[PDB]
């Protein structure tokens, strides 16, 4: 783990078959047309800050033990795309935020008549201080949340 803490890999199923890698220290990584976005990805369809994939401190209880996930951090995919995006089965419209599983393929942009198929897969390496790395424990809950002014105040420097 030199500094990749995800590894975004828009996989052959996408239009565009490159690699991107979020580091730990980037936080959150922006994905969009403009490479103003960490990630780079170059679809006519897709925007400046198209998406991006937000980290936060997991909430969790009090750990009256030895225990993991006693705080760490989790990675929450946030799209702000107007094309909305699909994350395995969910979506996720400009303005949401998603839990990202480790091995996760999202789909950015899908085009029945232009076919327009985009979708990277979440690898991660490292885990810096991540309660699990992203793909929870007990009892997976994959469901699309809703952005609020924090979220919106991170893409305002993407």
Not at 117 to 126: L, P
Request: proline share 3%; aromatic share 8%; with cysteine.
């Amino acid at each position: 783990g030199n500094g990749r803490f995800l590894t975004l890999k828009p996989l052959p199923d996408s239009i565009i078959q490159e690699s991107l890698e979020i580091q730990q220290g980037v936080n959150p990584f922006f994905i969009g047309r403009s490479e103003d976005c960490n990630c780079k990805i170059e679809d006519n369809r897709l925007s400046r800050v198209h998406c991006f994939i937000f980290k936060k401190r997991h909430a969790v209880g009090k750990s009256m033990y030895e225990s993991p996930a006693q705080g760490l951090d989790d990675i929450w995919y946030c799209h702000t795309g107007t094309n909305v995006s699909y994350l395995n089965n969910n979506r996720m419209i400009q303005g949401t935020k998603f839990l990202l599983q480790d091995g996760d393929e999202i789909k950015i942009i899908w085009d029945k008549n232009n076919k327009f198929v985009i979708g990277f897969k979440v690898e991660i390496n490292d885990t810096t201080g991540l309660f699990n790395e992203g793909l929870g424990m007990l009892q997976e809950q994959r469901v699309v949340l809703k952005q609020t002014a924090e979220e919106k105040d991170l893409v305002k420097k993407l």
